[PDB]
């Protein structure tokens, strides 16, 4: 079997039967490495990263995968080896990323530089400064080391605001309009609780964010959640900004459902796409998953944010509960609509590095890297669902993005594979602790060393206006190239 630099064979068993869903059963040799399982017949090639493996179960072995397929095998050896190497963090080993020894002409770790990105946006300026208050992750330990905040806020006041926001995730700048100065700041829910606690500093801080947009007379807060779910959160000590505490602000709910319904949705969708589609009942089954309605809700949400910035010329604040699953989906979809830089390949890479990775989407937890707890309720395809949305925009706007569909699918494949450092861990701090930036390779090193493979030939770089995709089921499609890829 073929091997990456740093990859080692763990087992090679001959005469093993792979069971196609339809085309019977092939004979071949099964190699297990610490990176992948490999199966060859002599041509028939099955090449499957152990990262995509969710659970292994004797039936006679069933391999449940995370990329819309299963595998059936007919035979330490096999079971124990797949288990040991598919789930190394459950077995005192490291993820493969840390052994990968390839060297690329381009270093992906240099693609995103926070200070450069802020500078690309016109920052700092008179109203927004680069703050180092979190340079040791002591201020908010799930936030990146660098944040952008209003010039006028004192560090002591920011700390009070942090005590009033879940996990200390205070409002910080995500994007600023280069003409109006309207901004998208992001945060987590305020800790109001059932007795309507108030924090003068929080109220005052939201007010300074508004005053930084000097022409504007109000501030909009998009709360990603359903009204009912925000109310539940309120009884638990969370909640949202009130009309009376935040006088110059107005809050609206985007009604996006919680991470568990998204997991359940994708689960139902896998049932009907693999091993085969029953086309006689395809229409209702797919409808029954509600997968495309949740896509629509998100795109509709992001358009509202985009429209308010671009047309309304009004600064907005996006928050959810912890401000790192739906918040990250919404700010980055709206930024993508607003700023054509992010529709280039390097721009989209900074967008994922910044809004997703540097701000703490819990990738390790949400995806389950190298951990065997398949039933964990903290796993959810939040990032996948986001990439689907992005794919929706490339399809309504087939010349607007520099990257192509294979770019997006390649990202999803390496979301699971752990070949690269890029989607490792749950927050920036964890990444410095675990030596990710020194012991692992960036996904973008690979992608950007082979740009032609991932480029949209139809791309036109002056399609640089705000894009408002149409959030209607009539204008959306099932991403069959990804979801039905395996048959």
Numbering used by the authors: 98 to 139, 144 to 160, 171 to 186, 194 to 605
From the paper:
MTMRs are part of a large group of tyrosine/dual-specificity phosphatase superfamily (PTP/DUSP) members in eukaryotes. Typically, the active MTMRs catalyze the dephosphorylation of phosphatidylinositol 3-monophosphate (PI(3)P) and/or phosphatidylinositol 3,5-bisphosphate (PI(3,5)P2) to produce PI and PI(5)P, respectively. Most MTMRs possess Pleckstrin homology (PH)-GRAM and coiled-coil (CC) domains in addition to the phosphatase (PTP) domain, and some MTMRs contain extra domains, such as differentially expressed in normal and neoplastic cells (DENN), PH, and FYVE domains. In this study, we determined the crystal structure of the PH-GRAM and active PTP domains of human MTMR1 and investigated its substrate specificity through enzymatic and mutagenesis assays.
The MTMR1 structure was determined by molecular replacement using the MTMR2 structure as the search model and refined to 2.07 Å resolution. The refined model included four MTMR1 molecules (A, B, C, and D chains), 652 water molecules, and 6 phosphate ions in the asymmetric unit. The refined MTMR1 monomer structure was composed of 14 β-strands (β1−β14) and 17 α-helices (α1−α17) that formed two individual domains: the PH-GRAM domain (residues 98–205) and the PTP domain (residues 226–605). The PH-GRAM domain, which was originally implicated in protein or lipid binding during membrane-associated processes, exhibited a β-sandwich structure formed by seven β-strands (β1−β7) and one α-helix (α1) that was similar to the MTMR2 structure. In the MTMR1 and MTMR2 structures, the PH-GRAM domain bound tightly to the large and shallow cleft of the PTP domain formed by residues in and around three helices (α6, α13 and α17) and a loop located between α11 and α12. Among them, one phosphate molecule (D3 phosphate site of PI) was positioned in the deep cleft of the active site pocket and was mainly trapped by its interaction with the main chains of the six residues (Ser(Cys)438, Ser439, Gly441, Trp442, Asp443, and Arg444) from the C(X)5R motif. The side chains of Asp440 and Asp443 are positioned away from the active site cavity because of the formation of hydrogen bonds with the side chains of Lys285 and Arg484, respectively, creating sufficient space for the phosphate ion or D3 portion of the substrate.
